[PDB]
């Protein structure tokens, strides 16, 4: 009989809920009632990116704030020059089904993955004029959905097998395996200190993990639908989460509870990108209504609307220095937005 | 523009030129999706033409075909079924001998209904391949068909039994006006299956050929 273990599991869950309620005394909306509102924010597409022949599924910003890498279903990885719009590289891909792409912090490697269950690492600083695949990370039985670079040698990967893995480039083996997710994990984001990273799965939950020991500390709940996007706050003690349900939720690594939700009645679509700004005041959320609304992180107010896409927006990232914001949609176009 | 800046611009134009050439080749290739349920004769159909998903390429009458075997993903279907939007047709494989083995046919019907009423495939033609007909004739002579369908009223023959199964799969679509479903029976020694796929995609090519003409 295993019902005795279930009974004590429910008691532990009740204790967790009771602890969250005790620590909750004031809503983030109430404490920020004396802050001057931002007002209205207008962003214009300074540069549009042309050259993709299929829907764009992922895009990542380099650490130099100039180089952009975009992944599409056409099977081509393109390294874009944001300032000058020219294409630095065009890496052919063995598998045309790509769901995620990563840029190394040092800029010498580019990662890609998709339905082939393989995280291909491409060497972008070859002596030759071409870019080869340095490693083909294999071992995942589920579709790759998000991969991020800890450093030039360590790369984390979230796949459709409901398990996240830490990969070693030199040996091509899983150093640590993250288990505990019932549903397949879609999106992940690394903390600024690289020691932590959150994972969002279809089980309507987000989990905090440790790189060193490969164990889960906190499980975040509150979403009524599956999680599609999740990003870390600039500070590192918080993180926002996106879901198919038209709502954005902000959690803390210390309070271990939701503070304020970002939702509207006029919106009923899904969320694909939740990337934060540099200062963390602005929350940019990509949606399925061809729109990328601007959310005030401290007030859940509508400060601006980013429109101009003819299809669903699938990727959205903020550059390292926060100067400009790039948005990629299924219309095979990437738009870089800036203020005036 | 500087000396090296102009050189970078020229490289981008050459990169764009190569990208356009590859896209023209891709636009001339027919994409097909294989969505069989529970290994319902996936091997026999694939071998008749000419690790995660399997990419199968074959050419028939100067037309290149791309077939994807995505049934081995074993994950959330709705999280990657949108990547197959715009596909020319969907090839469905259902074994006729699985009705005698929470029935296996009901599992195929549930997955068929999921993709026939899917938003991403609201106009994609479906090619239903009812394979393993050789064993169906032998099985129908020793096992009644009423096990799978309690509402069946016909006899234990084969021609009427096959029509009833085909009819059941043809009433699972709520968009019959805008989407057509093709049904075929394939045996072990059959060799005309590739022609039927070619015939099915010709109609799809017809629909999208006059779409650029401003007719639909």
């Amino acid at each position, epitope marked *: 009989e295993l019902d005795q273990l279930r009974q004590e599991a429910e008691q532990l869950k009740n204790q967790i809920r009771d602890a969250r309620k005790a620590c909750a005394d004031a809503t983030l909306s109430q404490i920020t009632n004396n802050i001057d509102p931002v007002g209205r924010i207008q962003m214009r597409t300074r540069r549009t990116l042309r050259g993709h022949l299929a829907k764009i599924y992922a895009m990542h910003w380099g650490t130099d704030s100039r180089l952009l890498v975009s992944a599409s279903q056409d099977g081509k990885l393109i390294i874009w020059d944001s300032y000058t719009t020219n294409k*630095v590289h065009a890496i052919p891909l063995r598998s045309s089904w790509v769901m995620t792409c990563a840029y190394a912090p040092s800029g010498n490697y580019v990662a890609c993955g998709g339905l082939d269950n393989i995280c291909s690492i491409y060497n972008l600083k070859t*002596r030759e004029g071409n870019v080869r695949v340095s490693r083909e990370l294999a071992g995942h039985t589920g579709y790759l959905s998000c991969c991020r670079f800890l450093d030039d040698n360590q790369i984390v990967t979230s796949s459709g097998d409901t398990t996240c893995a830490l990969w070693d480039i030199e040996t091509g083996q899983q150093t640590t395996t993250f288990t505990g997710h019932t549903g397949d994990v879609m999106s992940l984001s690394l903390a600024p200190d690289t020691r932590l990273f959150v994972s969002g799965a279809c089980d309507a939950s987000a989990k905090l993990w440790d790189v060193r020991e490969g164990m889960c500390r906190q499980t975040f709940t509150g979403h009524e639908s599956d999680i599609n996007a999740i990003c870390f706050f600039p500070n590192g003690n918080a993180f926002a989460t996106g879901s198919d349900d038209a709502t954005c939720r902000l959690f803390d690594l210390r309070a271990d509870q939701e503070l304020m939700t970002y939702s509207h009645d006029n919106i009923i679509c899904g969320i694909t990108s939740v990337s934060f700004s540099k200062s963390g005041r602005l929350l940019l959320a990509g949606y399925d209504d061809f729109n990328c609304n601007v959310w005030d992180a401290l007030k859940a107010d509508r400060a601006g609307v980013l429109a101009g896409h003819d299809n669903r927006v699938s990727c959205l990232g903020v550059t390292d220095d926060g100067m400009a914001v790039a948005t990629g949609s299924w219309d095979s176009f990437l738009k870089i937005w800036n203020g005036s | 523009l500087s000396a090296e800046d102009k050189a970078a611009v020229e490289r981008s134009k050459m990169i764009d030129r190569n990208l356009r050439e590859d896209g023209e080749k891709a636009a001339r290739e027919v994409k097909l999706l294989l969505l069989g349920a529970g290994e319902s004769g996936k091997s026999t159909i694939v071998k008749q033409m000419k690790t995660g998903i399997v990419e199968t390429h074959f050419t028939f009458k100067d037309l290149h075909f791309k077939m994807f075997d995505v049934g081995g993903q074993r994950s959330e279907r709705k999280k990657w079924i949108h990547c197959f939007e715009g596909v020319t047709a969907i090839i469905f494989c259902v074994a006729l001998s699985d009705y005698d083995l929470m029935n296996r046919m009901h599992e195929s019907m549930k997955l068929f209904d999921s993709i026939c009423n899917n938003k991403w495939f609201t106009d994609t033609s479906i090619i239903l391949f009812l394979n393993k007909k050789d064993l169906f004739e032998e099985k129908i002579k020793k096992s009644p068909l009423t096990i799978c369908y309690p509402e069946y009223a016909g006899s234990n023959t084969y021609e009427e039994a096959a029509a009833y199964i085909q009819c059941q799969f043809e009433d699972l679509n709520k968009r019959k006006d805008t989407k057509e479903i093709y049904t075929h029976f394939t045996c072990a020694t059959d060799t005309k299956n590739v022609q039927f796929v070619f015939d099915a995609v010709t109609d799809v090519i017809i629909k999208n050929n006059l779409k650029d003409c401003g007719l639909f």
Partner: single-chain antibody
Amino acid sequence: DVQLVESGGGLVQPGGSRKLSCSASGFAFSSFGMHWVRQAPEKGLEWVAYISSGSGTIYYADTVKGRFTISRDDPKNTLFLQMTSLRSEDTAMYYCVRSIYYYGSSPFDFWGQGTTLTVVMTQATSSVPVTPGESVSISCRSSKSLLHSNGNTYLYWFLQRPGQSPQLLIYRMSNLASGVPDRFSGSGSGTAFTLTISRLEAEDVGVYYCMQHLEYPLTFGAGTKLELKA
């Protein structure tokens, strides 16, 4: 590894014609822009011709314009340079240099061995006495402001050890080339440039050649030899 072997040298009578075949092996010749640089005996370097990756864009030196014709064969990975009406000043060692848009610049990273042919941007004193273990600084000057509107200064530093092909050290006067020690460094302000070396070694003896990649018309420097003290 990366190799660039040239052939087609020897004794050429004045007014004749000859062709140089710089064979390419170990790298993608199709995506690499190629340059021709000649070095007169006991003299410096001077740019001759350049061909882009797609052969669409080709420039030429003023002294060799029209008389010299260049071509490339991407499938055969071989670079050609046919010459017409060779003069007395055309005798030099011709090097084929592969250039690619890399790190926001076009490094002259690899230089060929060269072949024997027989028929603005000033530098400091050609001879400077140096000793191992000491720091030596080499200065440079330009007739025009090499700084561009994009904030990039186009300066290239080259090392030509005796009995060896020139090797790139610093490109864009701020980024070290691949395979070079961290001792070398560069600085400047768009008109005056200096190169600083932390610690000298027995392999640092040679002639330092400066180069500008601003306009085309890349004018090399006279040279700076660092001989060992007695």
